[PDB]
Write an enzyme that holds these catalytic residues in place. Structure first.
Site, PDB file in Angstrom:
ATOM      1  N   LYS A  73       0.824  -1.198   0.000  1.00  0.00           N
ATOM      2  CA  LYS A  73       0.000   0.000   0.000  1.00  0.00           C
ATOM      3  C   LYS A  73       0.867   1.262   0.000  1.00  0.00           C
ATOM      4  CE  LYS A  73      -2.361  -0.204   3.914  1.00  0.00           C
ATOM      5  NZ  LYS A  73      -2.798  -0.556   5.303  1.00  0.00           N
ATOM      6  N   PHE A  98      11.994  -5.596   5.839  1.00  0.00           N
ATOM      7  CA  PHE A  98      12.818  -6.425   6.714  1.00  0.00           C
ATOM      8  C   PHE A  98      11.954  -7.180   7.717  1.00  0.00           C
ATOM      9  CE2 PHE A  98      14.309  -5.836  11.157  1.00  0.00           C
ATOM     10  CZ  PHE A  98      15.047  -6.996  11.266  1.00  0.00           C
ATOM     11  N   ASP A 125       9.162 -12.011   9.412  1.00  0.00           N
ATOM     12  CA  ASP A 125       7.887 -12.286  10.061  1.00  0.00           C
ATOM     13  C   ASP A 125       7.202 -13.499   9.444  1.00  0.00           C
ATOM     14  OD1 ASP A 125       5.733 -11.982  11.791  1.00  0.00           O
ATOM     15  OD2 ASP A 125       4.685 -10.580  10.472  1.00  0.00           O
ATOM     16  N   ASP A 140       5.961 -16.896  11.449  1.00  0.00           N
ATOM     17  CA  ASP A 140       4.555 -17.287  11.551  1.00  0.00           C
ATOM     18  C   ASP A 140       4.223 -18.366  10.517  1.00  0.00           C
ATOM     19  OD1 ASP A 140       3.473 -14.749  13.345  1.00  0.00           O
ATOM     20  OD2 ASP A 140       4.863 -14.105  11.776  1.00  0.00           O
ATOM     21  N   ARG A 172       2.112 -13.119   0.714  1.00  0.00           N
ATOM     22  CA  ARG A 172       2.288 -11.740   1.155  1.00  0.00           C
ATOM     23  C   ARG A 172       2.183 -10.831  -0.063  1.00  0.00           C
ATOM     24  NH1 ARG A 172       2.603  -9.175   5.660  1.00  0.00           N
ATOM     25  NH2 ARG A 172       3.533 -11.075   6.559  1.00  0.00           N
ATOM     26  N   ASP A 214       4.548 -11.389  21.389  1.00  0.00           N
ATOM     27  CA  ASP A 214       3.689 -12.194  20.531  1.00  0.00           C
ATOM     28  C   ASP A 214       4.046 -13.676  20.652  1.00  0.00           C
ATOM     29  OD1 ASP A 214       1.433 -11.545  18.884  1.00  0.00           O
ATOM     30  OD2 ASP A 214       2.596 -11.871  17.051  1.00  0.00           O
ATOM     31  N   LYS A 231       4.853  -3.995  18.705  1.00  0.00           N
ATOM     32  CA  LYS A 231       5.197  -4.587  17.410  1.00  0.00           C
ATOM     33  C   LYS A 231       4.541  -3.865  16.250  1.00  0.00           C
ATOM     34  CE  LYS A 231       1.531  -7.897  16.617  1.00  0.00           C
ATOM     35  NZ  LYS A 231       0.907  -8.102  15.279  1.00  0.00           N
ATOM     36  N   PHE A 287      -5.325   0.108  14.172  1.00  0.00           N
ATOM     37  CA  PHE A 287      -4.761  -0.466  12.970  1.00  0.00           C
ATOM     38  C   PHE A 287      -4.382  -1.934  13.085  1.00  0.00           C
ATOM     39  CE2 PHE A 287      -1.673  -1.069   9.578  1.00  0.00           C
ATOM     40  CZ  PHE A 287      -2.340  -0.458   8.529  1.00  0.00           C
ATOM     41  N   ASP A 289      -5.880  -5.366  11.446  1.00  0.00           N
ATOM     42  CA  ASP A 289      -5.125  -6.467  10.867  1.00  0.00           C
ATOM     43  C   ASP A 289      -5.653  -7.806  11.375  1.00  0.00           C
ATOM     44  OD1 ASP A 289      -2.552  -6.597   9.084  1.00  0.00           O
ATOM     45  OD2 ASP A 289      -2.335  -8.225  10.541  1.00  0.00           O
ATOM     46  N   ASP A 290      -5.944  -7.850  12.672  1.00  0.00           N
ATOM     47  CA  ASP A 290      -6.519  -9.040  13.285  1.00  0.00           C
ATOM     48  C   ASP A 290      -7.786  -9.482  12.563  1.00  0.00           C
ATOM     49  OD1 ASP A 290      -4.498  -9.128  15.006  1.00  0.00           O
ATOM     50  OD2 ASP A 290      -5.631  -8.450  16.782  1.00  0.00           O
TER      51      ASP A 290
HETATM   52  C1  LIG Z   1       2.784  -6.078  11.228  1.00  0.00           C
HETATM   53  S1  LIG Z   1       3.805  -7.108  12.001  1.00  0.00           S
HETATM   54  C2  LIG Z   1       4.065  -6.707  13.577  1.00  0.00           C
HETATM   55  C3  LIG Z   1       3.306  -8.675  11.739  1.00  0.00           C
HETATM   56  C4  LIG Z   1       1.832  -8.917  11.997  1.00  0.00           C
HETATM   57  O1  LIG Z   1       1.390  -7.886  12.837  1.00  0.00           O
HETATM   58  P1  LIG Z   1       1.590 -10.402  12.971  1.00  0.00           P
HETATM   59  O2  LIG Z   1       2.267  -9.909  14.224  1.00  0.00           O
HETATM   60  O3  LIG Z   1       0.159 -10.698  13.146  1.00  0.00           O
HETATM   61  O4  LIG Z   1       2.347 -11.489  12.248  1.00  0.00           O
HETATM   62  P2  LIG Z   1       0.862  -8.865  10.491  1.00  0.00           P
HETATM   63  O5  LIG Z   1      -0.232  -7.891  10.703  1.00  0.00           O
HETATM   64  O6  LIG Z   1       1.857  -8.494   9.461  1.00  0.00           O
HETATM   65  O7  LIG Z   1       0.291 -10.227  10.321  1.00  0.00           O
HETATM   66 MG   LIG Z   2       2.132 -12.838   9.855  1.00  0.00          MG
HETATM   67 MG   LIG Z   3      -2.293 -10.153  11.496  1.00  0.00          MG
HETATM   68 MG   LIG Z   4       3.637 -12.017  13.717  1.00  0.00          MG
END
Ligand SMILES: C[SH](C)CC(O)(P(=O)(O)O)P(=O)(O)O
Ligand SMILES: [Mg+2]
Ligand SMILES: [Mg+2]
Ligand SMILES: [Mg+2]
Ligand SMILES: C[SH](C)CC(O)(P(=O)(O)O)P(=O)(O)O
Ligand SMILES: [Mg+2]
Ligand SMILES: [Mg+2]
Ligand SMILES: [Mg+2]
Lengths: 336, 336
Positions: B43, B84, B89, B93, B98, B160, B186, B225, B229-230
């Site tokens: 974005k 990065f 990340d 996870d 992506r 996290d 984070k 924000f 994302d959640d």
């Molecule tokens: C943005 S950063 C901290 C990574 C994430 O916040 P996550 O912690 O849920 O893996 P995401 O929104 O990119 O999924």
């Molecule tokens: Mg993720």
């Molecule tokens: Mg997320």
């Molecule tokens: Mg994460």
């Protein structure tokens, strides 16, 4: 000397985990453990090389206590830089042992989170820097010396991994030009230039000509040292190297492979082509043989001596006007 | 606006891969590709939020060309910081998509080497910084703003992963106190404070009271924000989120789980306990149901509105003496 440094590790861990906005207690506590498990256990050539260089570059009447505290604090930063490169290095080369214990990523309950771990080790460097060398006129030089040191390492690593792609017969690319540049970036820069440089900067020698001088030496020192790591990786007592050699099975570009490829016969170039880079213990045991069949460990001894001399020649030409026993001391710590 | 920024990406890649001592050609070439594949595709809220803030914080007669070039250069640094954090990340996870393409670590020929990749992205930030903002009186503030931003993120990540250990029934720890601090470190710090702050510093507002002011707002912005994302992670068109949600199967501490755990009945607390955190599609499909059975997506809508207002209240109390349309602009970019 080594023992006075290690004694100070406690003070640094307490500076780093004091933080506990107690909203990050767990994260801090976690951090503390990553430091204990990963900063400690090594030889400490780097951390030590700085504190010993400071004393020899700063007049006795200027080696005050505070200037000392800042001395080994910067000492431990080089440690953490190593702790960081290592923790991530193991996951990538897929290691099992480091400093005679199992790799952090291998510990049950870590795995790939180690990546964030290695990151936290980096952030601790610059966190210490700001915490001790902040009001000093070399603070921005330290920082810019670490950042550009990492980036050089990081580049060298890129070279490495690039030159040893998993499951890919890559003898073609194991030339010496490559091996030199590879080691120059992933080992020589941060393990020899970085410690000394931090010393100089801390002592007031922000010179360019000076710094290129130390670099001329220290870099050549650093190439030998990796060459040492290559050998030790294969031909070295694990109980003294606190780790196992994965160079063959990792299809790395070693001094060894460069060495064997050099004096390997046509017929001998394959046994090679066929066994290098595989994870097969006997395929690998086959490699190690061809080395021994090539007299390489003696070819190593030679260089170790011819290199020593050249470095010495080098020190005897560029150390001026630094105490020659700033380089002489390094080449007693490694050239053994 | 977005299009003028993306246009400049070429100039930054050319500054970064020019380097080719041609002894690192391959490493550079590699680097170039990691930048194309990982900086581009998003974005660009962050990179854009800085260049739009500069203009609104620096007088027209001071927005010269050079000061502009430095403006979006710092814009792209925030990009690389993201590039990065992302690349690393995903591996952690364990992602697959992506920006509507497969994760870099998943690309055939990358895997765990991505770790060094993510590292190189970091080194590119500070490499640009030194290359443009060096002679400027905010250079050390930029650097110290990035380093402490990363460390905050890195801490938040520690939180996290710490709160969502693989294969461990962890509903106990999905409280709100935790979720807030987790997101504060984070996400909020580097995605909202960082961009604005870089702007201020670049405009001369090195104030402490000022900076705490923007922070007061921007942080609260940043919590919403992540909350976004959640939700998007679960209830959002993959074709618009360019990625899949692994929060349940990753046993993450989501606003959702915090939300559902809040208004979940005894009987409903298990279906939960039993299905959360597993990799089982139907175990996970079971979870998503309990959400929908809890009316959560409407509970989301509420907050999205009550949060909006509070932020607005906030902006209407702390923006002074900054152009209110420095925060107002952010809350049009995300609060949609
Ligand atoms: C943005 S950063 C901290 C990574 C994430 O916040 P996550 O912690 O849920 O893996 P995401 O929104 O990119 O999924
Ligand atoms: Mg993720
Ligand atoms: Mg997320
Ligand atoms: Mg994460
Ligand atoms: C020291 S650092 C660059 C890593 C190594 O050099 P590697 O490149 O062979 O994995 P090692 O000597 O620690 O094994
Ligand atoms: Mg390696
Ligand atoms: Mg290794
Ligand atoms: Mg080695």
């Amino acid at each position: 000397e080594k023992q006075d440094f290690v004694q100070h590790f406690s003070q640094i861990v307490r500076v780093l985990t004091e933080d506990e906005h107690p909203e990050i207690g767990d994260a801090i506590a976690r951090l503390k453990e990553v430091l204990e498990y990963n900063a400690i256990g090594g030889k400490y050539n780097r951390g030590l090389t700085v504190v010993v260089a400071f004393r020899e570059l700063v007049e006795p009447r200027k080696q005050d206590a505070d200037s000392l505290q800042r001395a080994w604090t910067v000492g431990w930063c080089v440690e953490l830089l190593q702790a960081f490169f290592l923790v991530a290095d193991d996951i990538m080369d897929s290691s099992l042992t480091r400093r005679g214990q199992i790799c952090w990523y291998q510990k049950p309950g870590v795995g790939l989170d180690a990546i964030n771990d290695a990151n936290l080790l980096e952030a601790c460097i610059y966190r210490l820097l700001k915490l001790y060398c902040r009001e000093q006129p070399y603070y921005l030089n330290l920082i810019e010396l670490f950042l550009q040191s990492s980036y050089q390492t990081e580049i060298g690593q890129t070279l490495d991994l690039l030159t040893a792609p998993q499951g890919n017969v890559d003898l073609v690319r194991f030339t010496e030009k490559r091996y030199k540049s590879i080691v120059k970036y992933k080992t020589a820069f941060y393990s020899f230039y970085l410690p000394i440089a931090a010393a100089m900067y801390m002592a007031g020698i922000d010179g360019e000509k000076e710094h290129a001088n130390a670099k001329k030496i220290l870099l050549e020192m650093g190439e030998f040292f990796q060459i040492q790591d290559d050998y030790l990786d294969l031909f070295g007592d694990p109980s003294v190297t606190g780790k196992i050699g994965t160079d063959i099975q990792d299809n790395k570009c070693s001094w060894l492979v460069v060495q064997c490829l050099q004096r390997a016969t046509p017929e001998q170039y394959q046994i090679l082509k066929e066994n290098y880079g595989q994870k097969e213990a006997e395929k690998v045991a086959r490699v190690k043989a061809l080395y021994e069949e090539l007299d390489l460990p003696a070819v190593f001894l030679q260089y170790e001596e011819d290199s020593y001399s050249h470095i010495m020649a080098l020190i005897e030409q560029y150390a001026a006007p630094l105490p020659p026993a700033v380089f002489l001391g390094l080449a007693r710590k490694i050239y053994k």
